Design a binder for this molecule. Structure first.
Ligand code: SF4
Ligand code: SF4
Ligand code: SF4
Lengths: 134, 439, 292, 134, 292, 134, 134, 154, 292
């Protein structure tokens, strides 16, 4: 786990991601249901990042996966979407922030990455999913 | 390269060897239900003989029951001139009460004719008998746990001249940490006296009479099942819901522990429930704890609210049999059977219980099984939600239906957050005295 | 197939499956795949239920044949309040393979015995055990000191109606179908019938057999009788039952209550193991007697 | 179960959903077959909601899933399609309304959500399937 | 569940699973599904490991219950150098089902015994055998001519510290954890303890039991001792072991080396099969003697 | 089973459906075949109905599934394609009509329906399959 | 088996079909492998017929499947592609014609058909696969 | 225990279950706490006898005995049962790994050193199923088990 | 592998599987994966057949190894009229693992015995039972009152050619390969050979063994002989058979027909169970005799 950097600045339009829950459920077949939640929290689970710049940006991006990545390190993630609460219901969010200001430490959900060449200097990679391990 | 048809081979071993790691029998399985696999149990010993080898195991028993014993330290034949020995027959382990009514090969010998010295086999470590001063004190064995009976200057004249097979009535009180707390008669009495006296006679009211001759021996079922788990090492054992008298059960050494206990689960029918880590042994009744309607079951795996299986008519055990021990007279293997009047055409299913019980009780038990095994044809396979998870694994469900409202005791609860149940049909009226006359 | 081979050797064939089960009661039920109600015998096969007909198996060995026969339960059909109460147990089937164009072109695949019926989710699934179900079971007597036969049996014929033995009286006070009050308790001994046949011949439980216990008359000939098991169908406090008398299956209860001690079919004396290995000691009683 | 709010007002064209019936069925291979249902109601089973507004609406929408949501709470649902009956047959609907005026309390059929960024201010999420648990 | 039914009958529930295992050593370990460290007893359940909680099964039969309980091994956790050496064998668990909002709303699903642990690929999988594991095993004595008990046992109490019997000396020369040099060999007989308990109470192998063999002192009281098996944790040539003396479990070795020949719990004479079927010939020795 | 109404009048272009048979078949591997028919009839098996009108038509259509539907009732079906015979071969159809004039009583082949909103007043649902239970 | 008629005349562009050979095969993992066929003929196996005419043609086409069809009858099939031999190799075809002049009696490879309505008079059905059973 | 392999952890192949070494430790409730024989006396009058070996820590249960019909002396029988009670507790651990055909000369009965980061525990192997990827069900075997027990006689 | 480790430790390897089976007849067959015909011994391995080589298994236990070895049957190959008739039964294989670049770099994976061969769909599938197939079978004699050995056996050596005992004559009239006319019937007794070896050494069934029964000569020395079983290959009414004489395996038929009553290897008298538990009554015959 690191505190190394946010990310390369570029993120394409389509960087999707939202919180998860396990919340297993029985669906009582002759009436309503009853369902349990063991979390009290949520994995933010950001997906579908895309790097799109010159090939000068690519070699600092492929080794972003490699050098400080490996598999098992932080690389605090920037959200385009210390405790934050959500007060728009009379309920509350009250979800903690271990890192400062929406920085949500994560890890990539990939055994490999796949960078493509689109033109003499175009570097693309279609997806880098994350799940924000604590 | 590809794989062969040892894909069937790796499906068995150890593909199915992992299962029974983590897990006549014709009537044994139905009485435990879906339940679990009924282990082979209680091939009853007829012609009790004493083998003097070194590979026979130490027996154990609870109450008035004959046991064969075996020879340990017999001296050489001594000719008076027409023979004499000095036997020592070791019956069973633990502190026992006294051994009376010895009968050898054949009918009966009077114990007053013998010179036997009985021993309790006390953990107090009884000293040497001094008849083993034939051997001398320096090599005299001094058996701690086992309860041996020596025999002194035994004339081999009336029974041939060979050694006869001796068999001994033994009374053994149930021991163990749960037994010393809550004392029953065998030490609870603390002086009864009141011998009626006032002298072929009037024994027709002995089964209903206040006096306690004979039946003072019989241990309560609570402590004997506590003795099993105590010897197995489970001291967390919970047994306050048991109500039975044992009267001379006997399992041998290396009888699996549980297979000795499983004969009692056929006789008195109790749950062996284990709600919590206490392993509650409660007596089985029809007392309904659930009251589910049909609207209150969960969505199962097979997407049926209640799968109801009715077993085959060709296998209903039309007539049931036992192999109990006589327990009043000369202890001998006997048999009673219960025959259902409509379908007597076949399906004999018998089993053998090695305990000792009386005559009206045996016809009561087989009358109970023949009713239960035909009641326990119906099994239900439903899933109930974890909103009511307090249905323990041995409880019984009312289970209101549009057509029937038939009770169900449950087995094989597998939950993972969705309690899925293999029940079995159980009625309340099965568990009653049959009220039969005696012999 | 029996001389439909002319129909069958042509690729153009039309054999639609169909079967009839005869219940333990005298009524039969009809089932067919043909989707139109058809009959050849007086059975009136209905395609409203039954009939998935999955994979009849065979074997030269004594092991049974099997067919799970998935279907539907309905008010015209089995209806499952009939099935749960104790009917359809030894139900005998014949599966047929009729030509629906001409039902005189048919045969029997097997005649079965319908062992295991699993009903659920608004449907039923009923394993059709083969012809050889009875083989594979234990039948025998074990020399036990009781009797061995039932009252109606050939080994002990009784003429069970020969006097005022049977209690023919109509029922009242059915309660939870185990207790039965019975208005006409009076007419017999207390605890007369303790192992008898409670054949109920009217109403809901029609021709249904239970076994009695606890024949006790509390006041003015009430005769409150328990049973071992539920009847499975509730009697309606107006049904007629008849109860044959109770046999304890013992020599004393045989000859005293009943006259038929001749037809005993039991083994009263049966000396024992300890007698067998006993050698005769020349002491005490060694004269000829009962050994009892 | 809550009574908190309807929803964000925006719903895209394509918000699908209609009643779901157990309809346990036997399918006799002969021909005609019988069937029965144990509900006597119908789970309305609305799907395919889409939030589309500015990013100011997104942070009150992502914590709508989180704060009063979790998994197991009401958030009464607005239908663009006290007892209502349906009299267009000679049979009847006679279906109850526990909440007032078509408000059908539900829950989302998702372990996670997935909000996307499509431009400097565009917030999108493709689906939020519900089932109106009683 | 024990009076959380008010919490549980509502569909809004929040019961997060959690369990504690107590090792054979006095320490316990904590495990929870809740993803936040919580405690109710002094256990401090950690969500850093353990906890997949797959499908606890049940049965009225004596057969055990089971739960495979997939998880993770780490330095705070089991760490698998602890597990492989011989710990966690008879580890006792309780699984709980706590409310994480209020941990006073909990019960026990079962109390287990954790039989089979399969670790691999950086994780562990540990079958939780049920409460009834001890049933299903053979326990008995077979009248064999040795003894039958261990030294500390109730059937042969010894007071194993009563004199200079135990060898308390600290260890040197551990080599391959089977050979042990032992600086303080001198103080006892050669080959004094041949079946003893090598309890090692310091360092890496803390409270770990092995069995001795080949108690030989080579020069100046070295006392090189082998063991049957590896300890599984390497002692560090500074640990303290104590070795209880060796019992050959024989009458001669009982009474000579030890005083406790009274508490024998063994069967020395035990004549034999050929004695039993023998009839007494009237030739040679037929006077009363040892038969040995 | 009802005799309630035909249907809403609207049906989109693409309402597909044609008769079925089981007619199980062995395909004798070294020559020709032989095959059996247990029906003597055919399930007409109409599929792919689409309602397309205003939202005023939708509430009389969603409860068409619900009110007289449930699952297990008739709602006689109108075919855009008393015994009718087919004489264009020298064989014959001779297929019965329990209802009058091509009205083929059916049931919907759905546990749920799925009505969509396409515009302020557009109501669409893509499919309602039927099989014509007797 | 019939001799009833060819078919409706119309067949759309795309009526595919060609001979099907058992070709039992061993595929030795070494290399070359042997094979044999037990037919000495070839099932012609025509597929993808399409009827496209007015709705007047449809009712004589839907009962073509039903009346003389059922499942198990001939309806001799017209090929747009008495013994015919093929002499373009020095081998020979020598394949028989039980029916006259390319008429190849078949059966449809369908439990059901699916006729669609595409406009006031348009009748379409996408496929009727046959296999020319002898 | 003569080791023929000397594998490091880096030198195993990719198995089926995608674990380099699956290591199974058997249940404590079934470890055979006391073992028994039924040998024949072989010096005196040939009679069935029995010796047992009891592990001092866990004597609480799991009696596991077998019967051998051969004839052998008194110190040898206590030597054999002393060997089984040590071996059956050693052979609790089994390993299930796959090793590449680059070293296929590991015959089906050889024993592997198997260096790990934590332990370096030997393993004798069984049930080799290769097809071009030797996959192994090993079992834990120590060298010191196979020695004379050096006991006194009768 | 035997010193191809230098070839094998490199990742660049090229070991192509190949095996030879030796039939019960002297010919061998060759099989390889290499797709080019190669040989190292005089076997000429052909890739035209055989060789899928699926998953040889092993075990320290006595249980066999197995390999199903999918392949193809053809006229050069096994051809399955050879296989069905009774050849390839105890066929012995060696599987090899040769380098096709250099066939001197090879070893044996196992030497098998090819137990179960399942042929179908124009292919064959042949389970290669391991080296330990013979273990796992019952071998013994049960003291029965017949003989126990075959004629050629070491326990009864006979010199089966020593006189005019064998019938060497060439065959005519093969009919359905059970009846055999035999032109030269005359030369021997009627019913001389009733349990003999019909070794046929020419033509189709080359070296194939059947057993005779019903040695009857009908007219002018025809000697029509049946067999128990079909030969599996039709003899062509010109083949040469030789038939060794028939042994009834009985003491009377031993010493009369054959001289070799010394080498009996049988148990004629063998008194019985009822003799064993009998006590000697002092009545009737109690003098020394045959007890027969
Ligand atoms: S007592 Fe008599 S009537 Fe009754 S069963 Fe026995 S023999 Fe039959
Ligand atoms: S020799 Fe004595 S101390 Fe040692 S085990 Fe035997 S009885 Fe116990
Ligand atoms: S009869 Fe003679 S030759 Fe024939 S098998 Fe017997 S011993 Fe051998």
């Amino acid at each position: 786990a690191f505190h190394e950097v946010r990310f390369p600045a570029n993120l394409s339009f389509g960087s999707v991601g939202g919180p998860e829950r396990r919340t297993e459920i029985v669906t009582l077949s002759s009436g309503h249901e009853e369902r349990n939640s063991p979390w009290a929290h949520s994995r933010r689970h950001y997906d579908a990042g895309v790097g799109l710049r010159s090939l000068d940006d690519v070699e600092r991006l492929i080794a972003f996966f490699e050098a400080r990545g490996g598999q098992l390190h932080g690389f605090r993630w920037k959200d385009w979407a210390g405790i934050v609460s959500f007060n728009e219901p009379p309920p509350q969010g009250a979800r903690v922030t271990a890192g400062f200001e929406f920085d949500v430490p994560v890890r990539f959900d990939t055994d490999r990455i796949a960078v493509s060449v689109q033109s003499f200097q175009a570097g693309d990679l279609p997806q880098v999913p994350v799940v924000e391990v604590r | 390269a590809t794989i062969l048809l040892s894909a069937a081979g790796a499906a068995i071993g150890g593909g199915f060897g992992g299962t029974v790691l983590g897990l006549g029998r014709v009537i044994d399985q139905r009485l435990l239900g879906s339940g679990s696999q009924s282990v082979e149990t209680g091939r009853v010993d007829r012609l009790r003989l004493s083998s003097a080898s070194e590979g026979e195991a130490v027996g154990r028993l609870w109450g008035r029951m004959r046991v064969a014993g075996q020879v340990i330290w017999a001296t050489r034949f001594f000719e008076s001139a027409s023979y004499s020995l000095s036997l020592a027959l070791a019956l069973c382990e633990g502190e026992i009460l006294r051994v009376g009514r010895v009968w050898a090969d054949g009918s009966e010998i009077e114990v007053s004719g013998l010179n036997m010295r009985v021993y309790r086999g006390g953990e107090d470590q009884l000293p040497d008998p001094k008849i083993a001063a034939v051997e001398g004190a320096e090599a005299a064995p001094a058996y701690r746990g086992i309860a041996y009976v020596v025999l002194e200057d035994l004339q081999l004249a009336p029974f041939g001249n060979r050694v006869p097979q001796f068999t001994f009535e033994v009374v053994r009180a149930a021991q163990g940490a749960l037994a010393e707390a809550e004392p029953d008669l065998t030490r609870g009495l603390r002086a009864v006296a009141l011998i009626p006296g006032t002298g072929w006679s009037d024994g027709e009211n002995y089964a209903r009479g206040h006096w306690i001759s004979g039946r003072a021996v019989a241990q309560p079922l609570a402590s004997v099942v506590a003795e099993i788990c105590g010897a197995a090492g489970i001291t967390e054992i919970d047994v306050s819901g048991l109500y039975g008298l044992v009267r001379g059960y006997t399992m041998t050494g290396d009888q699996t522990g549980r297979a000795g206990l499983q004969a009692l689960m056929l006789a008195y029918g109790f749950e062996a429930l284990e709600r919590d880590g206490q392993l509650v042994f409660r007596m089985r009744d029809g007392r309904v704890a659930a009251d589910l309607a049909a609207a209150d079951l969960a969505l199962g795996e097979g997407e049926a609210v209640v799968e109801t299986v009715r077993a085959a008519e060709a296998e209903i055990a039309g007539r049931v049999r036992l192999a109990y021990v006589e327990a009043e007279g000369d202890f001998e293997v006997k048999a009673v059977e219960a025959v259902f009047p409509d379908a007597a055409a076949g399906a004999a299913a018998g089993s053998e219980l090695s305990l000792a019980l009386t005559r009206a009780q045996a016809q009561g038990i087989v009358g109970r099984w023949l009713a239960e095994a035909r009641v326990a044809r119906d099994t239900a396979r439903f899933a109930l939600p974890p909103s009511r998870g307090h249905l323990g694994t041995g409880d019984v469900v009312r289970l209101d239906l549009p057509e029937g409202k038939r009770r169900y005791r449950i087995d094989r609860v597998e939950q993972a957050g969705l309690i899925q149940v293999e029940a079995v049909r159980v009625e309340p009226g099965i568990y009653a005295p049959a009220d039969e006359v005696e012999d | 197939p029996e001389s439909l081979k002319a129909h069958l050797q042509g690729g153009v064939t039309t054999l639609a499956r169909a079967w009839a089960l005869a219940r333990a009661d005298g009524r039969v039920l009809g089932f067919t795949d043909h989707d139109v109600v058809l009959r050849f015998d007086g059975i009136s096969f209905e395609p409203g239920s039954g009939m998935t007909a999955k994979a009849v198996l065979q074997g030269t060995g004594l092991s049974v044949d099997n067919t799970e026969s998935y279907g539907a339960l309905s008010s015209e059909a089995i209806t499952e309040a009939d099935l749960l109460a104790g009917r359809y147990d030894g139900a005998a089937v014949t599966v047929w393979l009729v030509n629906w164009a001409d039902p005189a072109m048919r045969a029997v695949i097997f005649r079965g015995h319908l062992g295991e019926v699993s009903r659920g989710a608004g449907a039923f699934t009923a394993e059709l055990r083969g012809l050889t179900a009875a083989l594979g079971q234990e039948q025998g007597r074990i020399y036990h000191p009781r009797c061995a036969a039932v009252l109606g049996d050939g080994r002990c014929r009784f003429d069970l109606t020969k006097d005022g033995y049977a209690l023919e009286a109509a029922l009242g006070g059915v309660d939870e179908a185990v207790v039965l009050r019975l208005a006409e308790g009076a007419g017999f001994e207390d605890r007369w019938f303790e192992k008898g046949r409670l054949v109920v011949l009217d109403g809901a439980a029609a021709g249904l057999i239970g076994v009695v216990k606890n024949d006790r008359l509390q006041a003015d000939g009430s005769r409150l009788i328990e049973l071992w098991q539920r009847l499975g169908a509730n009697p309606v406090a107006g049904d007629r039952v008849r109860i044959e008398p109770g046999c304890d299956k013992r020599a004393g209860t045989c000859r005293l209550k009943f006259d038929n001690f001749l037809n005993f079919r039991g083994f009263p004396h049966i000396p024992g193991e300890d007698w067998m290995v006993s050698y005769p000691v020349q002491s005490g009683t060694n004269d000829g007697g009962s050994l009892f």
